[PDB]
Structure 1
């Protein structure tokens, strides 16, 4: 019955909130705030850079995670108008995305050919 507030997939943070009915009285029901954050201990600071240093500090601004500037459509009396959902936005992130695929260009040398081939940083998402 819990709804998903954000389901951010490159900063692993699944914010859900449920109004769990703790009693028959509908006033003392507590509004839960489940924030499930999966912290990659082996991912680097720039995830598209293999040679980047390992990430030691993970900072999760939940005001930035809960941001919404996909403009929704509301229906007025004589018009359909795009509606901005937040005043915050008008970005670095720590985990790979399962839907996306990230690539890196590495120099491969056989003598002096120096062919700049590409490398699939994750293998499963590019070629399932």
Structure 2
């Protein structure tokens, strides 16, 4: 019965049409250092073939620099460590 259950945009169409549109998220998902894209588009045709949310099973990541005593070093950090693994 559930025609489409895209978790990228949380669009579920039971044939009901449910779409959650979280406001807090940066334009670019690759890094947080990007404008805040408030616009949201939900093309049903395209969706039935640039994500906004994050899947529960998906654990994104981005590389960031760190400097303590020596030289700047790049280390990976997960945007949702709870999903990855008080």
Same fold by TM-score greater than 0.5: yes
Higher strand fraction (1 or 2)? 1
Structure 1 residues 24-56: Cα deviation after superposition (integer angstroms, max 9, x where no partner):
xxxxxxxxxx11001010012222211111121
Deviation at 1:68, TM superposition (A): 17
Specify every segment of 5 or more residues in structure 1 that has no aligned partner in the other structure, as ranges: 17-33, 70-93
Give every structure 1 segment of 4 or more consecutive aligned residues whose post-TM-superposition deviation is greater than 2 Å: none
TM-score after normalising by structure 1: 0.60
Aligned in 2, Cα 1:68/1:106: closer, same or farther, shift over 3 Å?
A: closer
TM-score after normalising by structure 2: 0.86
- Of structures 1 and 2, the larger Rg is shown by 1
Deviation at 1:63, TM superposition (A): 0.3
Specify every segment of 5 or more residues in structure 2 that has no aligned partner in the other structure, as ranges: none
Q: State the number of aligned residues.
A: 85
